[PDB]
Structure 1
Amino acid sequence: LDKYSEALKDAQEKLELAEKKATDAEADVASLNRRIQLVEEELDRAQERLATALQKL
């Protein structure tokens, strides 16, 4: 029992840490997707503004 309880506190702690890693990694998948979309949007806008600048050119 102590071995399963301990193996569990460790599987569970490793899990909280892996889940945290996933949570933080996911927080970053999301922060990266926000930056990617902000930058892709600025890029598409740079390209819209470029197409416009080129049209205005």
Structure 2
Amino acid sequence: DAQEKLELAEKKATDAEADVASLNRRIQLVEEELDRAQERLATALQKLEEAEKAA
């Protein structure tokens, strides 16, 4: 029972790990997009400042 609970808890952890791992992949991909969007934004904003200077 400790072993079944262990395999199960290991799976609670493995599944929780699969889920956090899925989430870690999502944070890495989304946060990378956050930063790319933020960088694209910084770019758009820097371009905006120049576009406004151009305006």
Q: TM-score, normalised by structure 1?
A: 0.79
Which 5+ residue runs of structure 2 have no aligned equivalent? 49-55
Alpha-carbon RMSD: 0.7
Deviation at 1:56, TM superposition (A): 1.4
How many residues end up aligned between the 2 structures?
Answer: 48
Deviation at 1:55, TM superposition (A): 1.2
Where has structure 1 moved over 3 Å in runs of 4 or more? Answer: none
Deviation at 1:17, TM superposition (A): 0.5
Which 5+ residue runs of structure 1 have no aligned equivalent? 1-9
Structure 1 Cα separation of the partners of residues 46 and 2 of structure 2: 61
Q: TM-score, normalised by structure 2?
A: 0.81
